[PDB]
Amino acid sequence: INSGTTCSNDLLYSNTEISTGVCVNYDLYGITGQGIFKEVSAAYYNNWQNLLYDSNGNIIGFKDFLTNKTYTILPCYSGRVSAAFYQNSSSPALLYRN
Amino acid sequence: VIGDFNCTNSFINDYNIPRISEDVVDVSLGLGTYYVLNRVYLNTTLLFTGYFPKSGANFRDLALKGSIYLSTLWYKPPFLSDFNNGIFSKVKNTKLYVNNTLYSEFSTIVIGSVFVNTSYTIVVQPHNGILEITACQYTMCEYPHTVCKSKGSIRNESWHIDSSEPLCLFKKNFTYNVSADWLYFHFYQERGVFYAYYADVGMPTTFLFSLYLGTILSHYYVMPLTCNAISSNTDNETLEYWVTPLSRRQYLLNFDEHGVITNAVDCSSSFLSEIQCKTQSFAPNTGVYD
Amino acid sequence: LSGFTVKPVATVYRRIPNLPDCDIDNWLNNVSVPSPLNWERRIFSNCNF
Amino acid sequence: ANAQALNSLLQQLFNKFGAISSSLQEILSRLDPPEAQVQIDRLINGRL
Ligand SMILES: *[C@@H]1O[C@H](CO)[C@@H](O[C@@H]2O[C@H](CO)[C@@H](O)[C@H](O)[C@H]2NC(C)=O)[C@H](O)[C@H]1NC(C)=O
Numbered sequence: 439i440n441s442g443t444t445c446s447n448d449l450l451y452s453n454t455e456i457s458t459g460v461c462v463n464y465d466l467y468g469i470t471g472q473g474i475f476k477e478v479s480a481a482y483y484n485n486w487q488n489l490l491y492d493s494n495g496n497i498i499g500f501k502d503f504l505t506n507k508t509y510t511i512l513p514c515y516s517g518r519v520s521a522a523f524y525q526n527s528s529s530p531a532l533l534y535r536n
Numbered sequence: 537v538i539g540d541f542n543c544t545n546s547f548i549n550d551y552n553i554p555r556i557s558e559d560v561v562d563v564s565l566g567l568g569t570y571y572v573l574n575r576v577y578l579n580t581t582l583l584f585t586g587y588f589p590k591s592g593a594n595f596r597d598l599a600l601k602g603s604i605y606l607s608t609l610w611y612k613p614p615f616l617s618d619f620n621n622g623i624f625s626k627v628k629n630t631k632l633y634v635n636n637t638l639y640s641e642f643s644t645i646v647i648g649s650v651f652v653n654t655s656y657t658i659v660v661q662p663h664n665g666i667l668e669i670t671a672c673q674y675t676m677c678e679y680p681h682t683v684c685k686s687k688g689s690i691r692n693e694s695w696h697i698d699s700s701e702p703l704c705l706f707k708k709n710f711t712y713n714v715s716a717d718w719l720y721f722h723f724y725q726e727r728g729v730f731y732a733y734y735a736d737v738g739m740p741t742t743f744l745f746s747l748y749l750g751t752i753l754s755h756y757y758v759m760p761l762t763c764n765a766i767s768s769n770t771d772n773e774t775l776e777y778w779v780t781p782l783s784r785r786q787y788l789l790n791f792d793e794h795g796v797i798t799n800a801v802d803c804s805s806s807f808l809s810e811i812q813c814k815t816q817s818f819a820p821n822t823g824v825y826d
Numbered sequence: 827l828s829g830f831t832v833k834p835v836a837t838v839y840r841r842i843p844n845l846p847d848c849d850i851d852n853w854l855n856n857v858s859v860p861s862p863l864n865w866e867r868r869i870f871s872n873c874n875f
Numbered sequence: 876a877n878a879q880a881l882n883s884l885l886q887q888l889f890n891k892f893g894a895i896s897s898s899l900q901e902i903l904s905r906l907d908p909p910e911a912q913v914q915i916d917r918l919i920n921g922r923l
């Protein structure tokens with residue numbers, strides 16, 4: 439008990455469901471991160487290739503082996519707001535660039 | 537000097553030389569390099585620091601063949617080399633024909649340490665086109681060998697005496713092309729984990745697996761093939777099992793719009809290679825570099 | 827000024843299995859049922875159930 | 876030149892500066908708090 443090699447795979451694969459992009463976390467194939475997912479067809483994967491990387495070293499795509507599908511990863515939103523405030527005012531004027 | 541258990545003491549002779557080949561490792565074509573573990577690069581140049589040969593060192597033929605009697609010097613250096621930091625192997629597929637039926641068998645590789653039964657030994661063994669890779673507590677015999685299925689010999693293959701199945705960390709089966717000419721293998725370890733790469737046909741090498749062991753491996757060994765074999769007294773045949781060491785070096789690889797390597801250049805071979813690696817391009821511009 | 831930047835939930839976990847499955851239900855649902863006098867025994871190890 | 880400067884400034888987030896990794900997610904979820912402080916401090920010093 440709680441030793442050896444034979445174990446139970448029931449506390450790791452619980453959800454087994456990928457959303458349509460809600461800026462969720464992931465711990466895929468050892469590498470972890472956060473982002474949204476988007477369904478995009480891909481025909482460049484192979485039998486031993488499941489992840490897509492760029493020249494910089496980030497994650498771009500991901501192939502799920504339990505469903506034989508390919509998704510792309512988009513970064514989450516992290517920006518600031520420009521607030522113009524006068525001398526005596528109640529609420530400043532907000533601006534979200536782009 | 538492989539195992540520490542007596543399994544057989546029959547047909548044990550004393551002595552009956554690694555054939556150094558004149559060819560060198562070729563680069564800028566794809567041979568020698570390998571794909572990433574599971575990462576894909578499309579239409580880009582990547583400067584990757586990995587484990588590769590240096591300039592095309594000479595190979596060593598470690599293939600051992602026996603007919604009736606075995607030898608004691610075979611289980612000793614320089615036949616039992618040292619797995620310093622990596623091994624790149626090139627195997628020749630021995631294609632035999634019996635009753636208009638094709639068969640393909642070759643040697644068996646065992647990497648690890650002494651490991652009578654204390655630590656794991658990673659053994660890759662071929663079975664008529666099925667590569668079985670197992671990392672367990674296999675007990676190596678004092679004189680192991682491997683017989684061939686087609687045209688069997690008079691001895692019996694027995695390299696482990698484990699009556700009960702011991703604990704294992706990775707046991708898997710892979711399928712390769714049974715009508716291939718050459719096979720390529722790439723083994724190395726880093727940060728405590730051991731990687732594997734194989735290639736049945738093609739210039740680059742494909743990914744096999746990565747296993748966490750925690751300990752540093754010591755030696756690798758190719759088991760002999762005591763069977764109806766390369767001995768040309770009846771049928772002509774040739775076996776070539778070349779092995780070359782590895783080294784931590786930085787290469788520059790290219791990927792087209794599909795994801796297959798077209799050419800790969802070094803960075804410590806010629807003066808132009810250094811410029812190509814500094815500019816990260818195969819056709820650098822005009823200028824004066826240091 | 828900055829925003830909220832809440833913490834995401836519902837993590838996604840994926841990993842390739844190293845050892846194959848045990849497949850005990852295949853032997854438990856065999857076409858032949860042994861007699862109580864035989865009580866055939868089978869050992870399973872280095873697998874995932 | 877401006878694009879190269881921006882890319883070089885962005886690429887600094889993938890360096891370790893002596894730490895076990897370059898991402899805090901696998902640092903705060905693998906080791907205990909009282910021993911990752913030095914790694915976080917080294918990362919902060921490098922980025923600053
Ligand atoms: C995902 O696609 C691959 C490739 O089409 C499938 O692998 C095939 O599986 C069948 C049935 O086991 C075999 O006959 C083929 O030889 C396999 N092809 C290759 C290239 O390996 C795989 O089964 C698919 N997975 C799922 C869950 O549908």
Ligand SMILES: *[C@@H]1O[C@H](CO)[C@@H](O[C@@H]2O[C@H](CO)[C@@H](O)[C@H](O)[C@H]2NC(C)=O)[C@H](O)[C@H]1NC(C)=O
Nearest residue numbers: 539540541542651652653654674675676677697
């Ligand atoms: C592990 O290996 C050792 C030898 O490497 C085994 O010891 C042998 O055990 C058999 C059976 O009792 C004896 O006949 C041999 O003489 C032993 N060899 C030596 C060198 O003493 C041992 O049984 C193996 N298993 C364990 C659990 O230790």
Ligand SMILES: *[C@@H]1O[C@H](CO)[C@@H](O[C@@H]2O[C@H](CO)[C@@H](O)[C@H](O)[C@H]2NC(C)=O)[C@H](O)[C@H]1NC(C)=O
Nearest residue numbers: 662663664666667668669707708709710845846
């Ligand atoms: C990998 O292939 C080998 C050989 O095809 C398999 O070994 C066979 O296992 C079955 C079941 O125990 C035996 O009935 C056969 O006699 C074995 N063959 C040989 C040549 O020994 C092995 O089980 C395969 N491994 C996996 C994980 O599928």
Ligand SMILES: *[C@@H]1O[C@H](CO)[C@@H](O[C@@H]2O[C@H](CO)[C@@H](O)[C@H](O)[C@H]2NC(C)=O)[C@H](O)[C@H]1NC(C)=O
Nearest residue numbers: 577578579580581790791792793794795817819
């Ligand atoms: C691979 O990358 C090269 C380098 O960017 C691409 O070549 C450029 O393609 C764009 C159009 O996509 C042209 O406007 C540029 O003039 C091209 N530059 C050069 C130097 O050729 C090439 O198209 C890419 N291949 C793909 C995407 O399949």
Ligand SMILES: *[C@@H]1O[C@H](CO)[C@@H](O)[C@H](O)[C@H]1NC(C)=O
Nearest residue numbers: 447448449451452453454875
């Ligand atoms: C294994 O059992 C767990 C426990 O309910 C379940 O969530 C999971 O889907 C099962 N896995 C498979 C492959 O059936």
Ligand SMILES: *[C@@H]1O[C@H](CO)[C@@H](O)[C@H](O)[C@H]1NC(C)=O
Nearest residue numbers: 712713714715716717736737
């Ligand atoms: C095996 O190699 C032969 C000769 O190159 C080729 O004709 C055949 O298509 C190959 N088979 C596979 C499955 O790659």
